[PDB]
Design a protein around this ligand. Sequence first.
Ligand SMILES: *C(=O)N1C[C@H](NOS(=O)(=O)O)CC[C@H]1C(N)=O
Length: 354
Amino acid sequence: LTATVDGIIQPMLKAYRIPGMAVAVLKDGKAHYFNYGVANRESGQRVSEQTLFEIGSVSKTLTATLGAYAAVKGGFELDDKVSQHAPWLKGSAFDGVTMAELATYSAGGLPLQFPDEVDSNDKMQTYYRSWSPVYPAGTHRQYSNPSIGLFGHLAANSLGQPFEQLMSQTLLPKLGLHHTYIQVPESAMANYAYGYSKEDKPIRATPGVLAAEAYGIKTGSADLLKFVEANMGYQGDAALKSAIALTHTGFHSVGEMTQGLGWESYDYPVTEQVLLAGNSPAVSFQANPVTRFAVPKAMGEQRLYNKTGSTGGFGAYVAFVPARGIAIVMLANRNYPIEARVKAAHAILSQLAE
Ligand SMILES: *C(=O)N1C[C@H](NOS(=O)(=O)O)CC[C@H]1C(N)=O
């Protein structure tokens, strides 16, 4: 292995007091697992590649794959208006938003989170029915859980299924992810890590509206690397392969970052400075005018695809370059700085590419 994983990861774990981390890398078709520290600080139970971590917003890549799958299966087309697939949105602003804009955070300024008062399905429908766009559709990117959350919800229901059903019964089994969960079952609680807050309490995920779609997957590094493997020359089912290809399609760009379904990608080679900038709050916190594509673009293999994710007590990152057959998954039970995740992953990936 050309990479020096221990030498890059261990100083970072110390610098941010990360209790445990599961790292998995792919190179030349083989998976390598590097496990550090503890899943549970009071028992001392060790992290393995089967430890379940909250992967937070990395869930959006699975949600995007599910939505692309529903589109390939005929439930909807990406250029359909959103209200074509939700009778309760007819006449609302979503008459003028496409499913693709919803999935790529460009509907027009949907916020990062639902307002605190939205705590039921009924209040969720009312929220979207009364939503006032900040920007014209397709012109501005504001990263948003309500946006891709609604995409995942409506995509699944376009096949007559709840999101959780289509994810748990179709997408995850077809991807080969048998230890990946929206809700961790009884048989697997022994493997579920605790997270540790920035204030340092043991904490686990708070359920919320459309949490499953936007940030609610629990999985280990082995299962998550298997999903990344499917994103690098998947040999198999035509519908699922077409779905994955749609997630590698670009719909707009902000600076050097191109927004796909779930995945965000960069030209490869990519500098650390560019990858840091694309994952900084200058991109993730504020609404930015996008570079527009007249038609969506199949982006290609010689690119760095990535996604960050966090919960109250967890911090995750995934990046891969399909043309190189290299990948890194980093799942931690501390929500530690995105810049540290990016710097470490860029260093390791640069070495794997040698
Ligand atoms: C994803 O984990 N989340 C969405 C947003 N952070 O975006 S990032 O993950 O791309 O950095 C807010 C925090 C978090 C969440 N659980 O809502």
